[PDB]
Symmetry: C3
Subunit: 457 residues, 3 copies
């Protein structure tokens, strides 16, 4: 016998209903094998990879990751791939759930404005990555061409309260992290496995703030977690919790009660979480500079009653989550647009800088700029800041150490350099500070910052 030997397809042909991340199609809830017709369309389009940063994504179904496909082991799948006429590249597909050469690739080659099809039997239960298989394969995957297909076991997966769809990827821009504008793909960084962004669901903030996943205390949550790569292996972790279960692909092994689990490039897992106490739980790649410096953080927010017997402490804030603690960073997108249009106002900068100040500066200087007398100097009503705004630009870029006097008190500490901030980020942050807390107002421009970066003090 082949696996999946449940006889020929029966009942009526089923047009598959595909979902956009982070949502999942309903359970198939069927006891017979079917012919399932899947229709997926490739679209190439600009979208925001971060606030004010555009990227030309190549997508299955208009999203990164691509549309979720849900079938039953033993189904016959008639797979139709369309390539939107606006596409410049040809595309195809390899689904890891397919038994046969290229996982579908040779039969699915599709030029702009064309359609292809092929048929396969889903012999193997499991969660599987699919992706584009068009030379150069890495460029297509890097541009967002990956998703998940779930092949359910015949009896279905156990019932849970919520199912979600999260997929990591590594991205390669010409520009540095959070450098604004339309950023080209960078082949040299890709070949060197040196990504500028590492994301869940194709954007910074795709699953944070007002885009978080939700559940309640007591509920069970299943997450279908993929790693599209192209290159990185995820040290996949939930901050503040444990996974009840982790199962990779269609593997027989199930691990229980684990916190950190390695998902190979091209791999996928099904994780289960039980919500025990309220708050924000962070999905990360625990290769920490990915999660905290490249975008690899997503949120599952649990509503419900505190249990002080289990955890006496407070919800996550900007100390840990940084600028992603807030509902969104829309002001950054607005100020970037206004720079482009040539209509950038002081208030546009202030609201952008407000968003960026959280975590980045507030961890030491506090959210109200007060600092901590003799330990962290104030930015609120700060004589030192007012006395020399160019020096303040140098301090953000290049750091500051040694004895200073601020508002009549001595400090003798160290502020690390923050050179990774872009010229517009420094300018907007300092403009926010100057227009808050009885400081003198005015503004700092990105051009002001560019000059200080080129000639440090």
């Amino acid at each position: 016998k082949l696996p999946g030997d449940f006889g020929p397809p029966r009942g009526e042909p089923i047009h598959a209903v595909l979902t956009s991340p982070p949502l999942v199609p309903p359970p198939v809830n069927r006891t017979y094998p079917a012919k399932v017709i899947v229709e997926l369309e490739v679209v190439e389009k600009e979208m925001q990879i971060s606030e004010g940063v555009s990227y030309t994504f190549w997508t299955f179904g208009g999203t990164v990751p691509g549309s979720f496909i849900r079938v039953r082991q033993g189904d016959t799948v008639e797979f139709h791939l369309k390539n939107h006429p606006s596409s410049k590249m040809p595309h195809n597909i390899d689904l890891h759930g397919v038994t046969g050469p290229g996982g579908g690739a040779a039969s699915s080659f599709t030029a702009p404005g064309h359609e292809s099809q092929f048929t396969f039997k889903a012999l193997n239960e499991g969660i599987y990555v699919y992706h584009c298989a068009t030379a150069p394969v890495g460029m297509h995957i890097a541009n967002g061409m990956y998703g998940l297909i779930l092949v359910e076991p015949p009896e279905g997966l156990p019932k849970v309260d919520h199912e979600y769809y999260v997929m990591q990827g590594d991205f390669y821009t010409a520009g540095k992290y959070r450098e604004k504008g339309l950023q080209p793909f960078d082949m040299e960084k890709a070949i060197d496995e040196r990504p500028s962004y590492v994301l869940f669901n194709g954007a910074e903030g795709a699953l944070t703030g007002d885009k978080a996943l939700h559940a309640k205390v007591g509920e069970t949550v299943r997450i279908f977690v993929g790693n599209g790569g192209p290159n990185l292996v995820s040290s996949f972790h939930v901050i503040g919790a444990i996974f009840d279960q982790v199962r990779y692909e269609g593997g027989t092994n199930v691990q229980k009660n684990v916190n950190t689990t390695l998902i190979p490039a091209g791999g996928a897992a099904v994780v289960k979480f039980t919500a025990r106490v309220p708050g924000s739980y962070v999905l990360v790649d625990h290769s920490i500079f990915r999660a905290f410096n490249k975008g690899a953080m997503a949120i599952l927010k649990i509503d419900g009653a505190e249990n002080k017997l289990v955890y006496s402490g407070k919800e996550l804030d900007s100390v840990y989550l940084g600028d992603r603690a807030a509902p969104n960073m829309s002001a950054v997108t607005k100020a970037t647009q206004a720079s482009v249009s040539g209509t950038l106002t002081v208030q546009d900068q202030v609201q952008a800088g407000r968003a960026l100040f959280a975590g980045t500066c507030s961890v030491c200087h506090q959210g109200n700029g007060a600092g901590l007398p003799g330990v962290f100097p104030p930015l609120a009503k700060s004589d030192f800041l007012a006395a020399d705004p160019k020096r303040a630009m140098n301090i953000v870029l290049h750091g500051l150490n040694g004895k200073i006097k601020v508002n009549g008190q001595e400090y003798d500490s160290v502020m690390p350099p923050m050179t990774q901030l872009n010229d517009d980020e420094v300018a907007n942050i300092l403009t926010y500070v100057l227009n808050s807390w009885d400081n003198p107002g005015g503004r700092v421009s990105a051009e002001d910052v560019k000059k200080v970066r080129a000639q440090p003090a």
Copy 2:
């Protein structure tokens, strides 16, 4: 008790028969522990890491990976290491199957033209990496000094139709990927874990085309898969199939029905595959730029009857496999040699360029250069190409976008830059195109391309 406690060696001393990759010695097929004499000789020698690219490998037995060693748990192994007189370096061995300091390293230190020996009991069943353990350890491993030893369980492994031997490694050349000539080892790239090549069995194409592994529909295939490193962890994957079973080293755990499995640097696994439908199945590191831009692809070709109930589609082609779809790329080796000798002909370039055009250019321009009217412009009988061969060199290196007219039709698309191609590759590709499809002939030299690369348009 120690493990492996099967009493003293009995019968006659056995001179081990060692195999070159990708082949495996026969099952030991024995019910008693034996003294097994293993004789392995280190050879330092130039060989082709890619077509027209030489590298000084350091080998166990003249191959990368080194000769396969097959023994039975509870055997006494008398290990003899010889260092060929032509060697410049001393060498030794650490076998992961050895219980004792250095896995054999101090007792196996061997200068050029010398021999060493030591004895160990094989206490632990499993598949194990062996490698050189001579300071600087990473340089020796990087130059190819690794292989596998199988310590069988007492009753033997279950019978299969085929057994094969595949080992991944990361390689560090001074030159870039596919830059021709004798390439020195590059310590700086090695320390930074930035390999120029990532290979199965010591060369690009070692297991592709006319060097593929073979089996038939219905047959079972066991592959002993090693990762010699030195530095990379493999996201080891079979395109178009699943592994029936994966077992690491001598581990008790066996995973079944998995597609993607992480093999640590220095690790090894036994995988099993059942062939269900015909075609080419690709073993890759699914850190995708390794498999598709650095050489990390191998083929298992399955012969037999199509099963349209399982897979309705076509065999792998150059869209996915690129220039490795073909039986070999011997023409590239020939043209490189002819450049060195100073006898490079137009036809030498044409045949090299023919090989390199597959996938690289044909994915968009087609294998016959026809393109797709109004979508991908033709290279066949192309007025645009003929009008300006220097512009064509600039297009390959630096890309092309915007409105053009080719053979009377408008195109308004994007051809990405292909800067990673070497000067000789661009020159040979364009020479092929110029001497095909009623184009004007002539040639492009690598020196022509070098000048365009230095001064883009």
Copy 3:
């Protein structure tokens, strides 16, 4: 039920006794849940990351990794974090054993000279990483802020002869590996995941030589192995042995009889080893250039009777272990200090160079400088060396090949470049050689070497 449902805390409140690496607190040895009070203090301080190389570590309890915490599943833990007044940064904690947002992070935020506390129930047995969770999170982790907490199962872990505590981390210095002085943290290398050092227990040599772990033939050894990252995944391996068992975090899965095991960034495992034959067993990251070029090696030294039936060979030496075969490299620290003070003597250089010569040079030239006639030239009484000390500096930095005559014999071989050695290392090595084996004496300075490095021959 929640897990850990063993009723309210009983008996007396327990003040936890925390241990410094590589030691572990005693088993809890208790049948009832307790309130456990944990007091941990953050200290920022300079310490030696390698001989003569200082780094400002940020520590939990004054060590890297931080103090080990041992509790029982179902305990109520009242966690107190203090920040020493000498600190310049604020700090907090995320323990992977905590159920709740941030693993404790928001409730543990602590400015210099302050204290925080929070309470949590230990619901989940297992070994878990804890680390600082203060923006920028990666900088805090990179500076050493991580450790382990063991939550025992209710019945305790099985008894063993020895328990040890080892934790890997990746470190990012401005300077290159073994470049002397106080080295700043390097954010750019951290973001790129390009560490200068990869260590066990916060320093080169922390667990080698006269700092090795110990046990005897026949004994069982449990090691709690953490990977603090921030970024790297360890291909964790014991040279010369196998792990009886490996269990990750609180996972249900236990793997037996494995040699190489991948520990995620932020992950932890419990490994068990049975000592069968005497000698030095090396714990490494088998991403080999980490273990042999960046510091990622630790030793478990087993005392007891040889068993020639199992292993006929010799203890580890400098061929494999390099300069870490020796009890320590204190002379390097002394000579560095003397350079700083301006009191560097010839004998200070000689003793430093003696330490550095082991492995690095002795693998080919022997520990007595004799070489191997016609294969490796002598450094002992070497006419060639004496004739031109500047040439000798060029040879170490830039290599040597081709025919030479040394002490009346021809050599026609290759000495690779050793450019990664720092100016002081080359100077001290050559000073050692010049003042040994009837060579002419005198000295080479680091300034002499700096000039040759800038103008190769």
